Design a binder for this molecule. Sequence first.
Ligand SMILES: O=c1cc[nH]c(=O)[nH]1
Length: 228
Amino acid sequence: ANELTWHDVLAEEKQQPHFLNTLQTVASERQSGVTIYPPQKDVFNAFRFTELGDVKVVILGQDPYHGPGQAHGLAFSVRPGIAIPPSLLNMYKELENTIPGFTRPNHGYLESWARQGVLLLNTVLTVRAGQAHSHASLGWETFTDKVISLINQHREGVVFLLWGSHAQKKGAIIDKQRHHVLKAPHPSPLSAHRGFFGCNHFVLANQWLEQHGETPIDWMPVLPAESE
Ligand SMILES: O=c1cc[nH]c(=O)[nH]1
């Protein structure tokens, strides 16, 4: 497939009602004082780090971290000066019981992940504060719905790490004769203990990449950049 940038593919979408009437729901409450995660400039951050073309894997969570300084737009990632929260911890656990000689990192910044076709995504792009979901009745599920579709429509043989019931629907529109699709109960300490922990998404994905010529994913995160 030709080189189609999200700019290309999102367009119309951007320029659409349902969506617009979701930014509005958004802009608004942030405006009523109410603290919302993540700041607006971070909202689509994902699409920023990993472009549709370079899309190799898709991790689909659904509503960001409702903590202060947590959420930065990368489905499950945090910036460097932040402490790995339950969810990532658990990820890591899996990145322990399954990968070779993997030792969690001492950070929760998954930029590297992203830079390697990993579509660290969520269904609900924004959220109240310390209040789960609390924002799942707007055009959020509708946006992401298309996002997948677009992905689907395009780029062949993609593994969809679909974590949680919610994430599991809004991704179960994918033609499997053409894409790979896995199911794991949310990593979150509220659900992890139901199968997440046991799933093999990581390897099981690095396999799919293997057998189609695709370079596996370095699940070992890194905090680069240094100079005088
Ligand atoms: O990106 C994130 C952060 C918290 N919980 C999720 O499901 N995704």
